[PDB]
Symmetry: D2
Subunit: 215 residues, 4 copies
């Protein structure tokens, strides 16, 4: 039920340090090529008082290229879909929790996202908007208690050079019984391609490919 | 006069655990100078709650803490304007709860606007299986960092079979006006659910807290 | 087994960021009043290139005043004694692992201590010796898998004010079957009372008292 | 060039796990430019080892990593004078291991002095019950901070009955002379025990590592 070219629609409602906001996005991707892009609009809470990069890994592992020799948990879960929950622990104490419920209508994936971040220090790179980009990363995926887990430890490049680390822990839950994968990896690369001064409009790109490590 | 011997509480929580939304409203009373409060809580949406009610109860205000004259009281100084706080609660099995409270004052009644979001509680864990009994008493340590008051507490839920399930709280407190800042100190806490109905649609909750400076006694 | 006045002898061997050192100590204390004091000398690896305070909580919960209300896992364990293992995680990523095997010879406890600290940054408060003292602390003890655990989240105060946080996780192991206590707390207060310029001589004091949290009606209301 | 296509390794490790000391010595050989190495290891004291041998094996040299010309090689620039590293290893049930290695070069032989200290491994956990199978392949990220090189790796042990036991590595790498610092990059690893006797008094250990810089925008898969 996956076509070479899929559409994406999403809404995110959330809060950082107790300030609410809301973002909507339309996008396109090629699930068997592991590539997606999307345009995102802030609809409430603008101009955002925090670094936009903390949102972008939240904005669907169906858009990862899986080799034949690895079980693809995500494409197997449609038409019914799947959801995920995630905690993002930054190295200065900032914590974000996020959830995404992913459903499918026709050729369009539809995401409902909730995001809540707390304890970002006022003088930190997130609240001062001093991030540049996420570095390329490698996610580890493994089964525990009948569902799929993913961990990624990565970092944001910063305006003066330097790196601000963050650790992701994700739980993926298919809405039907699916084949379960063995331990594997997905390399990711996400960038903001364009944006306006206050990030009211963002064009965002991601590329992901599954592997098995040093062969 | 601002902070009276007896005060009222009004609150609404909205939140989600593992992506399941719910909402709760509360009405209560307390004694700010005695460090004691109680409240009755009603699930308004998302009931019956499919998780342990105990992960909510420390989210349901440090103005209700007995401060000796030895220690600057950040929280009573902050009224009438009020203060807000943010907290992350890290459970030893990977369950993470983020919460925020904005606390204002209308006459003799505190009003809380609470948001709660928990993720990654495992289906077979004591939270989703409702195997918790109560929070142990705890000691919070409060200290200033970069102009605001921080509080940390490492504590544990007692569980049904005997056993303890640990959690780390990290709270940032932000007064809404400039107040005098306290030196490093502690608050001892003790929170209990004194009654509840079977599915916890109605909960009666009590807390007791006193600040101190540690040893000597 | 446990006299009102007891003595202490210790030897610690360790490394910080891969640089080795060794310290010997003698002392005295009162296990029932929760007080002790010891004199410490650097034998090897001096002058110490790191903040001495990272060592001092490693230099025995037998020196803690327990009420009869709370089962005393530690006083129960002698003559045989007990051991403990500890990891201390500082907020900037420096980690110290320590072990202590505690035996008893006459009225003198003997400690065999090992200490290993890694990843302290060059310009942090440990390597640059900007620490002042440990704050008073509260360690929570609880049973798991038939042994006693204790966790403490505390902090060192810094030179120009401010605090440097550290989490301790300790495992206590009696060398014999003892009765295990319920969940409880030990308050602590550790202080360096005197030292010379580079801490090759240090006099250290500790006071420690067990309790069970905020009471419904506290006893401290007129005899 | 001080780095040759074939080079030998000599090492001694002394350490302890939950207070029980041991020592291992090893001899090996590896090809730094192909990123491969093998070694034979012998328990010299403290055997038979009461813990899973796997906790030791990532401690038994990033000079044996295949670096492309595209990425600065911090480790091969550091010789002959060499470099040292410190590491904490944080297992998901509370077990923690701190380790250090001081690496020098003698002729064309690498010499390691290793210190290992692990604490708080539960008695019924997979390490003390020896229920581990192997480390999964891993990816290390490397970045500069405070003018030295850091490496982090989050990985897991595979366990006998199925399932995985996670561990987080944090390493500091310090050249002994001034070298040029790399940009953010990665090393994929793969470590396996090729053979061992029943109590692991003798082990043959192999490792493969290659450096890279992440998912390419297009990549050299053009044909």
């Amino acid at each position: 039920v996956i076509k070479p070219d899929m559409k994406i629609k999403l809404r995110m409602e959330g809060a950082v340090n107790g300030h609410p906001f809301a973002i909507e996005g339309v996008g396109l991707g090629k699930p068997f090529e592991g590539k997606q892009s999307m345009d995102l609009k802030v609809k409430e809470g603008g101009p955002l008082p925090f670094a936009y990069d903390i949102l972008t890994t939240v904005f669907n592992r169906v858009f990862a290229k899986y080799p034949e020799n690895i079980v693809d948990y995500f494409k197997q879960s449609f038409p019914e879909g799947y959801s995920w929950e995630r905690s993002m622990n930054y190295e200065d104490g900032g914590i974000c929790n996020a959830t995404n419920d992913i459903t499918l209508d026709g050729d369009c994936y539809i995401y409902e996202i909730r995001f809540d971040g707390v304890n970002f220090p006022a003088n930190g790179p997130v609240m001062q908007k001093r991030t540049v980009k996420w570095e390329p990363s490698t996610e580890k995926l493994y089964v525990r208690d009948g569902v799929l887990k993913g961990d990624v430890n990565t970092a944001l490049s910063l305006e003066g050079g330097g790196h601000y680390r963050c650790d992701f822990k994700t739980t993926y839950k298919a809405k039907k019984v699916v084949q379960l994968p063995d331990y594997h990896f997905v390399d990711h690369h996400i960038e903001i391609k364009s944006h306006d001064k206050d990030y009211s409009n963002v064009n965002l790109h991601e590329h992901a490919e599954a592997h098995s490590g040093l062969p």
